Design a protein around this ligand. Structure first.
Ligand SMILES: *[C@@H]1O[C@H](CO[C@@H]2O[C@@H](C)[C@@H](O)[C@@H](O)[C@@H]2O)[C@@H](O[C@@H]2O[C@H](CO)[C@@H](O[C@@H]3O[C@H](CO[C@H]4O[C@H](CO)[C@@H](O)[C@H](O)[C@@H]4O[C@@H]4O[C@H](CO)[C@@H](O)[C@H](O)[C@H]4NC(C)=O)[C@@H](O)[C@H](O[C@H]4O[C@H](CO)[C@@H](O)[C@H](O)[C@@H]4O[C@@H]4O[C@H](CO)[C@@H](O)[C@H](O)[C@H]4NC(C)=O)[C@@H]3O)[C@H](O)[C@H]2NC(C)=O)[C@H](O)[C@H]1NC(C)=O
Ligand SMILES: *[C@@H]1O[C@H](CO[C@@H]2O[C@@H](C)[C@@H](O)[C@@H](O)[C@@H]2O)[C@@H](O[C@@H]2O[C@H](CO)[C@@H](O[C@@H]3O[C@H](CO[C@H]4O[C@H](CO)[C@@H](O)[C@H](O)[C@@H]4O[C@@H]4O[C@H](CO)[C@@H](O)[C@H](O)[C@H]4NC(C)=O)[C@@H](O)[C@H](O[C@H]4O[C@H](CO)[C@@H](O)[C@H](O)[C@@H]4O[C@@H]4O[C@H](CO)[C@@H](O)[C@H](O)[C@H]4NC(C)=O)[C@@H]3O)[C@H](O)[C@H]2NC(C)=O)[C@H](O)[C@H]1NC(C)=O
Ligand SMILES: *[C@@H]1O[C@H](CO)[C@@H](O)[C@H](O)[C@H]1NC(C)=O
Ligand SMILES: *[C@@H]1O[C@H](CO)[C@@H](O)[C@H](O)[C@H]1NC(C)=O
Lengths: 171, 213, 212
């Protein structure tokens, strides 16, 4: 029988407290029942609905999510990392090879408008935006690896995100 | 007042005089500004060198003109605690903050240095005016917490101003204090006194007089 | 309040430059947080509603944090500044909704001449191997002032001045402390306190101080 899979809507496995998140399954249901079974750190939820909704993410909602339907096996777990802070670098992919595109996003607590946003590599300003916008390198290069973070203004407060590492492979 | 980033916190040391005299009460004060009217609860946690303390006193929220709030918490400290270098920590919790705000304060670090205090009579050429300037030079002291007062025949001479401490070339501080008096009082033979308070002075106090001589 | 986009800072000329005819005072307009996308930045200088030119505007420099910084400098007339003419920088750019404007001018108020007094070291200080010469400058307005120390031509350097302090009558005062070796003071050298201020005749006065 096929293995179900959990999917993240939207697709950021790193979120900030009070962020909304939606998990949905990819497994067909039986004619008798269309119920879903959701787990969360092997704890078992309660609702049988096809999508699991986290309105206001707390730190207790981090961990391993998995699901299963009538005509599927237990899904492989997907990790959700709920961080605390003002800013959080988010990416669609975190693994990079030579000539891959690098898409980076500076997500803010409750989608608050962000201004004078700077993306820094290795402690130096690399790209600046008057208004919160995404950072995008067309085709990676071995020199684009390093520690990255983003800072800007949350209405007079000057705030920073935690740094992430970014290595470029192959070549 | 869009108040996007939520409140701000400011931590304030005790006034120098309050920590130099046993009969006075020194206090650390944590002020929270920009507190929204919608989400206004403010929780204060106080740590003394990393240990929680609960004898602090929280003032009621006050409405500012910019329609924000102002919450104050004051922690009275022990004289020896402040003078001995204990660290003081304010932790502020608010609904409009992602994590609590933490600020710490303590007496500046470094070997205290005793102040030399010197009384300087009015310049010759100032004696042609109807008011005169008694000067008090307090140099060579560390740290910059210091108090200076003026006094004549027991009663406190008030018509005076003291400059902020200034950094010397040897890392110590110095300041000046000026007392304006009417020339007659200086010409009589009255005595005036600069009083200085500092931790590195014997008995936290020295007095230097100045008179026609 | 405001959103993103460039920021502007307007800096006055240095007080000493406004007092000495041999010097050239300047007003300076700095623009920061200028993006590489729209990097055209236009300056318009107004001296009391009077579009001016001859403003040496410098080519943009890329900052460390990745932004661009652009500064325009306007040479200014000593009398114009001293009389209280207001100077104004308008900056325009594609990333700006409306152009930004700032204005500076000399502090308003009736000028008042400072009295300069030299105070010799105190008796008890004469024991240490260094001594302190004081210069009291009082009763002046505005606070824009320069103070220096001098001996036999060469300027003295081991001196420190306090910031101006608001006196009770609305005027300011300050002290300048010159530290010298005791020998120099006992040998009979003459030290001098020079003060520059607009309320002084010729914007300059000098008071001397020697071992009586
Ligand atoms: C809404 O309104 C409120 C209230 O506004 C008040 O009312 C209206 C009608 C107007 O008149 C306002 O002018 C008026 O203030 C606003 O609240 C204000 O917020 C600002 C910040 O934007 C605060 O500024 C800080 O001030 C401190 C010093 O503040 C003392 O001195 C003030 C006068 O100088 C005095 O007014 C204050 O009350 C306070 O007074 C002290 O009070 C304590 C306890 O009451 C008492 O024990 C003391 O004796 C007393 N001292 C006196 C009277 O002299 C200043 O230090 C802060 O500067 C630091 O931080 C800045 C960041 O903002 C930074 O830019 C500075 O460089 C500096 O940085 C520090 O530097 C030191 C070294 O120098 C270093 O060691 C530190 O590490 C470093 N970093 C720090 C500390 O983080 C700052 O300027 C006002 O205090 C506050 N006013 C009041 C009354 O609380 C509010 O902003 C408004 N909201 C909006 C959206 O506009
Ligand atoms: C990218 O980088 C650049 C530059 O980075 C520089 O280099 C790197 C390596 C790092 O070291 C940086 O830290 C470094 O600065 C950033 O550009 C800076 O941007 C900030 C604003 O975000 C500006 O801050 C202002 O600074 C002025 C004082 O500026 C003088 O002093 C600085 C040192 O104190 C010095 O660095 C400056 O060069 C400048 O020096 C003066 O230059 C003039 C002309 O060149 C010269 O004649 C003078 O002699 C000289 N003076 C010196 C050397 O001492 C400060 O006053 C500003 O504070 C006001 O505004 C604040 C709002 O931002 C407010 O909170 C304050 O309370 C204060 O409020 C104002 O007060 C005035 C007067 O009282 C009053 O009239 C106003 O009403 C009032 N309110 C206002 C104006 O709203 C402010 O702190 C830096 O100057 C600027 N630096 C440079 C070099 O351009 C850039 O931000 C970075 N970008 C990003 C995205 O990060
Ligand atoms: C799930 O596990 C993570 C990681 O150990 C933990 O942070 C979180 O609190 C757990 N949640 C539940 C509901 O058990
Ligand atoms: C915020 O402050 C940092 C240092 O804390 C400073 O380098 C920078 O200029 C400010 N950043 C932004 C994006 O305004």
């Amino acid at each position: 029988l096929p293995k179900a899979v959990v999917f993240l809507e939207p697709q950021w496995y790193r979120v900030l407290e009070k962020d909304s998140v939606t998990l949905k399954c990819q497994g067909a249901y039986s004619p008798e029942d269309q119920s879903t079974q959701w787990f969360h750190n092997e704890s078992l939820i309660s609702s049988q609905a096809s999508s699991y909704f986290i309105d206001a993410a707390t730190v207790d909602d981090s961990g391993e999510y998995r699901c299963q339907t009538q005509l599927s096996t237990l899904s492989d777990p997907v990790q959700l990392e709920v961080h605390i802070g003002w800013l959080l670098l988010q990416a669609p992919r975190w693994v990079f090879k030579e000539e891959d595109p690098i898409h980076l996003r500076c997500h803010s607590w409750k989608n608050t408008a962000l201004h004078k946003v700077t993306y820094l590599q290795n402690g130096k300003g690399r790209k600046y935006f008057h208004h919160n916008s995404d950072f995008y390198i067309p085709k990676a290069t071995l020199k684009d690896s390093g520690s990255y973070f983003c800072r800007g203004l949350f209405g007079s407060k000057n705030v920073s995100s935690e740094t992430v590492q970014i290595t470029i492979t192959q070549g | 007042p869009e108040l996007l980033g939520g409140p701000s916190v400011f931590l304030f040391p005790p006034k120098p005089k309050d920590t130099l005299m046993i009969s006075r009460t020194p206090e650390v004060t944590c002020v929270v500004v920009d507190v929204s009217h919608e989400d206004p609860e403010v929780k204060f946690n106080w740590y003394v060198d990393g240990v929680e303390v609960h004898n602090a006193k929280t003032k009621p929220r006050e409405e500012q003109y910019n329609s924000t709030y102002r919450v104050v918490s004051v922690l009275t400290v022990l004289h020896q605690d402040w003078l001995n270098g204990k660290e003081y920590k304010c932790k502020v919790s608010n609904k409009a903050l992602p994590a609590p705000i933490e600020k710490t304060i303590s007496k500046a670090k470094g070997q205290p240095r005793e102040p030399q205090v010197y009384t300087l009579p009015p310049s010759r050429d100032e004696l042609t005016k109807n008011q005169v300037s008694l000067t008090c030079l307090v140099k060579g002291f560390y740290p910059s917490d210091i108090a200076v007062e003026w006094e004549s025949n027991g009663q406190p001479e008030n018509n005076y101003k003291t400059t902020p401490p200034v950094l010397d070339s040897d890392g110590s501080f110095f300041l000046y204090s000026k007392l304006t008096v009417d020339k007659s009082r200086w010409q009589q033979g009255n005595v005036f006194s600069c009083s200085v308070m500092h931790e590195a002075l014997h008995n936290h106090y020295t007095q230097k007089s100045l008179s026609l001589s």
